[PDB]
From a paper:
ReAV is a homodimer with an α/β protomeric fold, formed by two tightly packed domains. The active site of the enzyme is located in a cleft on the protomer surface and marked by a zinc ion with an unusual coordination sphere created by Cys135, Lys138, Cys189, and a water molecule. The conspicuous catalytic center of the enzyme comprises two Ser-Lys tandems (Ser48-Lys51 and Ser80-Lys263), centered around the curiously hydrated Ser48 residue and located in the close vicinity of the metal binding site.
The substitution of Lys138 with alanine caused significant structural rearrangements in the active site region. In the presence of the Lys138 mutation, the coordination site fell apart and is no longer accentuated by the metal cation. The absence of Lys138 affected the position and conformational states of Ser48 and Lys51 from the Ser48-Lys51 tandem, disrupting the H-bond network in the active site area, as well as the conformation of the cysteine residues from the zinc coordination sphere. In the four protein chains, the metal site was filled with a water molecule (w1) bound by the Sγ atoms of Cys135 and Cys189, and additionally, in protein chain C, alternative conformers of Cys135 and Cys189 form a direct Cys135-Cys189 disulfide bridge. The Ser48 side chain has a slightly different position depending on the protein chain, without the characteristic pattern of three closely-spaced water molecules. The absence of Lys138 evidently impaired the mutant’s ability to bind the Zn2+ cation. Interestingly, the collapse of the metal binding site did not abolish the L-asparaginase activity of the mutant protein completely, as 1.5% of the activity (in terms of kcat/KM) was still observed (vide supra). Moreover, as shown by ITC affinity studies, the K138A mutant is still able to bind the zinc ion, albeit with lower affinity (∼26 μM) than the WT protein (∼3 μM). The low zinc binding affinity explains the absence of the zinc ion in the crystal structure. 10 μM Zn2+ greatly improves the KM of ReAV K138A from 2.2 to 0.5 mM, making this mutant an excellent candidate for substrate co-crystallization experiments, and indeed for further optimization toward antileukemic properties.
Residue numbers in the entry:
A (entry chain B): 4 to 352
B (entry chain A): 4 to 353
Amino acid sequence: SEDFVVTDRGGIVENSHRVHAAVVDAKGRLLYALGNPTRMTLARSAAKPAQALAILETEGVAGYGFDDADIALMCASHSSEDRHIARTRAMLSKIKAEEADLRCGGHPSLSEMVNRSWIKQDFIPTAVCSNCSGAHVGMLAGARAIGAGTDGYHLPDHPMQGRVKRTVAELCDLDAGDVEWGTDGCNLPTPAFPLDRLGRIYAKLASAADGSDAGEGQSTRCAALAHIFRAMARHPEMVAGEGRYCTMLMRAFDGALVGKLGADASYAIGVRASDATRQLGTDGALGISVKIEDGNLEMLYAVVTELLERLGIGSPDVRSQLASFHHPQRVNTMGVTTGGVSFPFKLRG
Amino acid sequence: SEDFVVTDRGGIVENSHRVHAAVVDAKGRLLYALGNPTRMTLARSAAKPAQALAILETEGVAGYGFDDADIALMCASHSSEDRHIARTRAMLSKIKAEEADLRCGGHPSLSEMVNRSWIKQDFIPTAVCSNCSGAHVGMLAGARAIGAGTDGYHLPDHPMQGRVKRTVAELCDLDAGDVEWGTDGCNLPTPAFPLDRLGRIYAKLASAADGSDAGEGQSTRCAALAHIFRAMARHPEMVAGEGRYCTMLMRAFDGALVGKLGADASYAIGVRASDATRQLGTDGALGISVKIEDGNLEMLYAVVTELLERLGIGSPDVRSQLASFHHPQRVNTMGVTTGGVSFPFKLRGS
Ligand SMILES: [Cl-]
């Protein structure tokens, strides 16, 4: 299963990157694969929708009045635009907390454009600027709602992180021992499980959206998953920002799916049932997860866009909005194109 | 074969990177290896000392009076610091040329601290700020020295580029057809050849400097290689810049080797004869070349340092100057250590 994305200079191989991908149905049955579809994989921020679920199922969180844009921010790895920071502060007021209560730190923006502004300003990013700030405020919310004490909401012994750990395992349909945990850049526990289970999570998100839309009776959990899908698709700029893959991908598909970046080159997508999914051989929703073995983001976005093409998800029209991600520009300092990106991999079913 | 450098988060595999490496003696004989030591590889800026050789061997260049720091800038991927721009301009004045004669383009500095300062200032890098500006001024020089005309010094049909292609193949001991050619970021022809041959080039640099130091007869080309090594070793800040691996590596070793980065994560080192190289089983200078298959520079610097330590080159003292390249920091936004870097490969030897 030698599946690669490859860059060339004048047709000479520059770099090559090993690709893993899983394509699963709404129960997580594996439908297509690249590389090792069960690779044990840190999901990183691609697990944010499952953290958002653990927040939304925390009793009393409903009392704070978070809106859909708020929930989308809980699912986000945002670009620290002024609207993201403003929303972080506004969410903190809702729970009568302060920036001092966050246990996440500032960092250079995920948007080069934002970061340039910051440099010109000599702006020092603080906790509320964290790309994960929405998820931390959600967790603080949960901690206050159960009377747990906000100190250490971010540590594994805290009930808020016990709810995350349980929720992740449940969504993956794994025993607790089959999920491993480390600590992320924003100082939260972050899960590792087989790659296909990441796609299983996103298949469940889209499936719940399908059930909601069709008027089907739903469990509290399904209803909440459907609320999360709608939040992300309706406010995709909260999930990332202007110019960001996730935001442009989700705007292009106009509610048809959701997508989320995980750091070090993971990606997950949840596709509502359609002609395309039926053509692929399932009668429900579908889930896609991808990992680039070496962590290269640019190659990741190329592969995800190629993968959608090969699955016939969308249209040439929809997917063209992502063209600059699909075939990255390889132009030298004098305006000369010096190479390209190719995709020597083969989907197996 | 499957030789990897692996990052982890809490002991959980995060990313893994395939490593190719060749360690060769002064004639290119292969001594140790990782991965595919003959991987067809674009050498990128690791080829710039071969380009300086072609420059220095061009009829009439000697009369411009380039000095050792000038030659070091020819061999460089510099950080575009003010001193690199000043030396680029000084070199243009040696050949009576202008910035408008350069055929390379500006780019974000290879240095984050320089680049931040540019952004703070709204500075737009120009031709003269290119990391290869030294090489471009040397190819301009050679074209003017033989009356070839400054326009098009960068094109493959130009006798300056004809001389470069010839010099590269000769240093690799390869036939012309065994070298492939693309175009680089700085708009020059750039070569590709088996990875071990990049190490062969750098063993020749180190062997030439040994023979010059011992004062045996030397070809004009061996004399020129010994000069390139000396210039790189004496002005390593010109080869890269403050804080840069190549500068800190050559400084630490104090003339015992030269080292040079290739874009998309190739590396080459040339090692003078030593108690270490004699312990490695060869009676002369040594060449090391490395390619990280996926192009990660952070992983490259980590692996090269691990390689020197495994090979016994330097002392634990010398190499401790490279400690934060050997094991890159893995500390999150709150000061918590979240992971690390390991080197689960074994060097194979024959
Ligand atoms: Cl981290």
